[PDB]
Amino acid sequence: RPTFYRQELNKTIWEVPERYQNLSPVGSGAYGSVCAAFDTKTGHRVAVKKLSRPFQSIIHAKRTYRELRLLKHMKHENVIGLLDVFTPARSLEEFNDVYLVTHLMGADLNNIVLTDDHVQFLIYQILRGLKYIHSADIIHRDLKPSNLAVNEDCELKILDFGLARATRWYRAPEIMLNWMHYNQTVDIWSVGCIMAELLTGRTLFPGTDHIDQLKLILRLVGTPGAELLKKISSESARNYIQSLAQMPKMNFANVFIGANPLAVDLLEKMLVLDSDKRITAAQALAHAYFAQYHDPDDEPVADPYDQSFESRDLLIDEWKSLTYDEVISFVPPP
Numbered sequence: 438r439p440t441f442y443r444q445e446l447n448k449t450i451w452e453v454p455e456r457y458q459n460l461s462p463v464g465s466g467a468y469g470s471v472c473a474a475f476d477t478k479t480g481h482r483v484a485v486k487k488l489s490r491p492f493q494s495i496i497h498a499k500r501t502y503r504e505l506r507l508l509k510h511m512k513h514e515n516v517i518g519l520l521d522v523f524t525p526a527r528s529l530e531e532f533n534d535v536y537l538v539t540h541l542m543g544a545d546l547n548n549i550v551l552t553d554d555h556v557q558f559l560i561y562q563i564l565r566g567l568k569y570i571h572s573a574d575i576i577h578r579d580l581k582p583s584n585l586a587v588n589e590d591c592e593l594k595i596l597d598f599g600l601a602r603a604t605r606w607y608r609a610p611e612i613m614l615n616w617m618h619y620n621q622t623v624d625i626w627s628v629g630c631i632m633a634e635l636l637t638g639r640t641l642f643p644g645t646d647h648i649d650q651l652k653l654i655l656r657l658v659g660t661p662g663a664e665l666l667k668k669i670s671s672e673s674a675r676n677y678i679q680s681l682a683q684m685p686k687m688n689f690a691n692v693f694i695g696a697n698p699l700a701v702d703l704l705e706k707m708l709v710l711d712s713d714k715r716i717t718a719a720q721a722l723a724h725a726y727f728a729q730y731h732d733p734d735d736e737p738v739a740d741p742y743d744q745s746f747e748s749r750d751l752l753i754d755e756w757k758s759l760t761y762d763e764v765i766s767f768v769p770p771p
């Protein structure tokens with residue numbers, strides 16, 4: 438066991454191993470706070486996230502355990518993974534803090550203030566990470582610019598995916614309006630929104646609320662034909678769509694006038710209302726727009742991922758002990 442040291446950063450306390458030096462606060466949440474640091478063992482800059490109150494309820498506890506499990510599993514260049522996990526606790530009984538460490542990333546994409554080959558490379562890498570996450574049967578559910586991290590080199594990683602766990606601007610219409618049996622393609626919608634906005638410089642669908650969001654989406658993609666209408670189980674939703682004065686599908690060339698037409702065509706395949714008809718991440722990577730980057734021998738899939746725990750309704754101590762086990766059993770990357 439290594440030696441630890443305490444300091445007090447901006448209202449919060451931090452006890453981290455001596456391995457990590459020069460913590461500078463970098464952001465925060467009800468979920469946790471983050472510091473950049475220097476990792477004396479590798480010479481690299483890293484990010485250490487302290488979870489806020491990991492075991493404050495059975496739902497905090499289960500979330501903690503979810504995040505750790507997911508992260509122990511994610512091993513892909515375009516996905517945030519786990520360099521380290523540690524607790525100052527020397528026993529399960531004193532176990533009440535969790536710290537997570539990964540490579541430090543310079544910025545996120547809401548910050549970015551793009552050209553065609555920039556859009557190509559960034560979307561290519563998101564899709565490549567999503568292909569991997571989707572293959573473990575994980576759905577991100579909240580892909581947005583602020584969740585995608587990027588260096589000045591334009592290397593990109595997805596943060597905070599998985600697995601259970603305005604944002605509404607990038608949300609797919611089926612998840613928005615509470616058709617609670619979606620699929621992985623909800624993420625492909627978000628990707629279309631992100632990509633639209635990188636090429637265009639504005640938010641594709643800036644809803645002021647969920648109803649308005651839906652109205653903006655229907656404006657571009659048109660109201661469902663009977664084919665999609667018949668798969669809508671809720672007369673609430675069905676009637677609302679069937680109360681909305683009809684609207685035609687716009688031609689994407691006009692709305693994304695001056696954009697590479699190959700991007701216009703990808704977007705058309707991503708931004709379909711019918712999630713049974715939406716292109717998947719693997720299909721998207723093979724689309725012509727990414728010809729400069731696609732390589733079917735270097736778009737790996739994931740080991741299968743046991744998320745059975747998700748149906749379990751356990752005690753706080755139970756979730757806490759399971760999290761501790763995972764911490765103990767952690768095997769550093771080479």
Ligand SMILES: COc1ccc(N(C(=O)Nc2ccccc2Cl)c2ccnc(N[C@@H](C)C(C)(C)O)n2)cc1
Binds near residue numbers: 484519520540542596
């Ligand atoms: C496995 O353990 C970690 C360790 C750190 C993180 N992390 C964050 O959670 N950051 C973050 C997220 C939301 C809001 C503010 C922040 Cl600062 C990271 C990871 C890498 N790089 C960053 N950079 C910050 C500066 C960012 C660009 C995301 O704002 N944050 C993720 C997983």
